[model samples]
Target: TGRPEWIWLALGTALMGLGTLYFLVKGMGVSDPDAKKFYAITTLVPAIAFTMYLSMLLGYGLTMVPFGGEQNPIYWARYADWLFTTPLLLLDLALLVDADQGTILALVGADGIMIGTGLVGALTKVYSYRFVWWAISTAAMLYILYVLFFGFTSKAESMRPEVASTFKVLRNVTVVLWSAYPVVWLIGSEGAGIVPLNIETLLFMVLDVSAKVGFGLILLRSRAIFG
Candidate 1:
């Protein structure tokens, strides 16, 4: 039989999936076009993606990396899920930062490169070459950080003081939390393999829960958050 830990994974991700469903439905009921648009993409789309991803992990297995540990050590499926969801999550940040259209689009475009290449790197056979892929993704992530933390944030100063302050806090929290992603990916994935497969699974699960569910929970507390 499959690992018993799958139950926990299914349970946790299921709860996350359920929570987002509520938001997704609530967002649909909102009359405001702008709020509806924001919530649909940010909540509904993510809910479906998480449900599918969680289901696959529960039913189909990780495809390589296991509950207790990794033997063959491939996680492209997970990365694929991330590629779809991460950018929409960025929309949340974009809303918070109020970056100009140009800046926000650039950030979204850049993130795809990071996640895309990261997946490529995972599938890459040569261990030495994988670092090259990670390096590229990291560079993209760094540039994104710069865009959010300084470039767009500096532009944010032009907006209202309270709005500016709110985004600033959001940006800082994002910078700190998002910054840890690459490190976790590096340690857990094929990049470095420093951590055991089981520990890596747990670590990644924690981050996924935080970024996916935690971010949504934060926004739920605010009725009408950033623009």
Candidate 2:
């Protein structure tokens, strides 16, 4: 009746993000302790907000379903939605806000390609893991591209009517970045062995746990939100 789940989830995410940031900065070898700590503090509020959002999403799914459904369609739908939206959200929030023009262009290009391959791969169920990874990876690549290409682009251009032109450039860059992961995976599967397992593992963790599960729980209030 009073958004108990959302409140809890938000607190949990805030705590987790804080703990992670502390460990990363204090325990890990971050070059600038002050800067890292500042970032860690800044991330706390959003982490809490995202957690609340995920709790609502989960709660919506539960409310949409009956108390006794054999298949738990709501759960499946929630999972699917998480898989689809998490990466895109994280990428957009993290990348598009501060990225340069050139970087944005690269991301648009790479992400677009990845999204294309992902659609086909998902439909065919061919290299399912790789396809999913590629999809998420494309988002990440787009972020990097945005950083590389348009990081220094004019702030004025970011708001002009001609901004749509910049947006087009950014969209294309995103596509390219999104596609880069799948292409690399495809190549690696062919024996190139270019990407490392650590990198892959980290990406999966970020996409699934940080983006999907963490945020999903904030949006959707479920018992599994904790685990």
Candidate 3:
């Protein structure tokens, strides 16, 4: 049943590549410097980052079975993806609202906490320490969420209604979709054996679609809606 995991991941790779093209093509046609840059960044950064994720999965197979530990899908390369994309995403949020320099720096710093700790939490071999890292990483994630949600939106409040609304909506979507990852990580078969691998793939796929494809689409649509 779980044998097709790579197939699903590979299909996501194709979809993500096409999704990047959606932003790249439209980015070419836009005139406003900031808006065009937003499109370009979305495509060049987060959109294309998913391909790196695909390459890792396809190249490594899903599970990284160790000599004496759990056999599971490793996230070494996925953390690399987040290392780039998550900072780029902060830059995106900054441009969307003309965010302050201090705010941008803080958010980017916090993003490191979220990504770095998550990588540690995911790959650590000690079973007891795994949950400890998970707790630490999850706490870091909540702080990042609070800042992105409340801090960014407060900054956004002064913008034009259309732009501010777009900021709000995207922030909401991002928070909800991403928060699911930690939960799935803690309980999924690959993570804890509480759920099957099929369930693990299914839930993560939905989160991925929303986080990547739908995230790009909402930004594009918000631009169109303003136009």
Q: How many backbone clashes does candidate 2 have?
A: 64
Order candidates by lDDT, high to low.
3, 1, 2
Q: What tens digits encode model 3's per-residue C-alpha lDDT throughout 21-97?
A: 87788878888777777787778764655667576556643346341355665646667777777677668777787
Instruction: Report the CA-based lDDT of candidate 2 relative to the real structure.
Output: 0.39
Candidate 1 residues lying further than 4 Å off, grouped into runs, are 4-8, 59-71, 223-227
**Model 3 spans with C-alpha error above 4 angstroms:** 61-69, 224-227
- Per-residue lDDT tens digits for candidate 2, residues 91-188, read 43233234455654554555455444443333332334534655565565556455434553444245443433433344454444434434544543
Error of 3 at 212 (Å): 2.1
Candidate topping TM-score: 3
Model 1 CA lDDT for position 27 = 76
Q: What is model 3's C-alpha RMSD?
A: 2.7
**TM-score versus the correct structure, for each prediction:** 0.83, 0.26, 0.88
- Given candidate 1, what's the lDDT at residue 108? 85
Give lDDT: candidate 1, residue 11: 55
TM-score of 3: 0.88
For model 2 the local lDDT of residue 42 reads: 30
